[PDB]
Amino acid sequence: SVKSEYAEAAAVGQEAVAVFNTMKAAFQNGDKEAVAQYLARLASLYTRHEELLNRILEKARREGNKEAVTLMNEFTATFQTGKSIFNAMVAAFKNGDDDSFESYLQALEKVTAKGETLADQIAKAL
Numbered sequence: 001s002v003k004s005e006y007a008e009a010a011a012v013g014q015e016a017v018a019v020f021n022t023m024k025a026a027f028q029n030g031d032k033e034a035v036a037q038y039l040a041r042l043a044s045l046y047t048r049h050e051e052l053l054n055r056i057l058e059k060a061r062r063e064g065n066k067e068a069v070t071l072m073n074e075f076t077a078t079f080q081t082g083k084s085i086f087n088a089m090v091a092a093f094k095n096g097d098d099d100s101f102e103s104y105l106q107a108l109e110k111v112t113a114k115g116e117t118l119a120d121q122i123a124k125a126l
């Protein structure tokens with residue numbers, strides 16, 4: 001069901017939260033080799049979260065679930081903001097710009113924590 005596919009998408013999101021926090025620790029400790037691997041893992045994880053989310057939106061649309069479509073359209077826009085920041089962090093890491101990596105790191109934490117409440121509304125609406 002779309003609701004179970006959303007619980008599966010939410011766990012994939014939680015994975016990225018967990019990986020991101022051990023990356024943040026590794027960045028702070030100067031462990032670039034770890035950061036690099038964590039960035040690659042997060043990239044696959046965000047790619048999968050986005051994929052699960054598009055399928056759920058498309059299915060909510062096919063189902064005519066108007067409220068769920070509205071909330072998912074907002075949530076996916078917010079997701080893309082997160083993704084654009086993540087991609088900027090990855091570039092900041094490639095360039096050795098740690099001041100911008102720090103910035104992008106903190107931005108992505110505020111975009112994910114702010115998106116939290118909406119994600120909690122979609123679970124109910126599907």
Ligand SMILES: COc1ccc(S(N)(=O)=O)cc1
Nearest residue numbers: 078079082083112115116119
């Ligand atoms: C990578 O950008 C993201 C990831 C997750 C979320 S949330 N907190 O699940 O809405 C928002 C943006």
